[PDB]
Design a binder for this molecule. Structure first.
Ligand SMILES: O=C(O)c1cccc(-c2ccc(F)cc2)c1
Ligand SMILES: [Cl-]
Length: 242
């Protein structure tokens, strides 16, 4: 079942922001959020789509492994870290759109649509350019639907090989210390209004796993750090992380 804790709204209010945090206790099978309605509001996934995109590229052989090098195409872009060679891990880390656009073109429309239906991913609509629909096309996904998809990935229940899912979960590695491990992916949607930020993933503890999915209005790049900062303040408040 689900429980709405509006006290977390303060974490958005303090920054004059609007958004939702969704948490899911895997052991107890209970969900928590500050806004049950926005928790189910569907947005463009933006770079959070790099998770399913990575899975499909790996399972079809478009990407052979996490060490394969994808050469910079010599095009200087506004993102300095994009102007270099990448593998799957660094492509994810620096959210390298042009590398995943190449993935998508090699995957192709037919296979992409088939696999998103198999994943039960959002509205499963890839309308638009095969290499940009997750940024300005017709695909939409809610925070709760992100958690649903992530839970399948965590348990290796998605309809791709176990190997593909293990590799993507490696590439999702974001933070790890003696207290917790976070595997997650950021998102920044700017091509279609409303501009929003994403952070989706899970926090691994010794004896439990908390999946999370948050998004927040993002009129400017100045607030991108709040995607992680707000989420962690909620995690701290709920005694999930110190
Ligand atoms: O989602 C991120 O964490 C991320 C990672 C790398 C780059 C950017 C980014 C993109 C466009 C922009 F206008 C400003 C920042 C966002
Ligand atoms: Cl790992």
């Amino acid at each position: 079942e689900w429980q709405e804790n509006k006290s977390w709204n303060a974490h958005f209010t303090e920054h004059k922001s609007q958004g939702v945090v969704v948490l899911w206790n895997e052991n107890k099978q209970q969900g928590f959020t500050n806004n049950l309605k926005r928790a189910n509001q569907a947005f463009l996934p933006a770079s959070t789509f790099k998770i399913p995109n990575s899975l499909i590229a790996l399972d079809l052989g478009v990407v052979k492994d996490e060490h394969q090098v994808f050469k910079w195409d010599g095009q200087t872009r506004d993102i300095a870290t994009w102007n270099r060679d990448h593998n799957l891990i660094t492509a994810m880390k620096y959210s390298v759109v042009p590398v995943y656009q190449e993935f998508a073109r090699q995957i192709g429309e037919a296979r992409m649509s088939k696999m998103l239906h198999a994943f039960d991913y959002g509205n499963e609509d890839i309308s638009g350019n095969v290499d940009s629909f997750w940024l300005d096309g017709g695909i939409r996904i809610s925070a709760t639907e992100q958690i649903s998809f992530l839970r399948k990935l965590y348990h290796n229940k998605l309809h791709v090989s176990e190997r593909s899912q293990r590799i993507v979960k490696q590439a999702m590695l974001t933070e790890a210390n003696g207290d917790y491990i976070i595997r997650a992916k950021t998102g920044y949607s700017t091509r279609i209004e409303p501009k929003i930020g994403w952070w989706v993933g899970w926090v691994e503890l010794d004896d439990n796993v908390w999946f999370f999915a948050m998004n927040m209005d993002m009129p400017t790049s100045d607030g991108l750090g709040l995607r992680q900062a707000i989420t962690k303040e909620v995690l701290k408040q709920e005694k999930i992380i110190p």
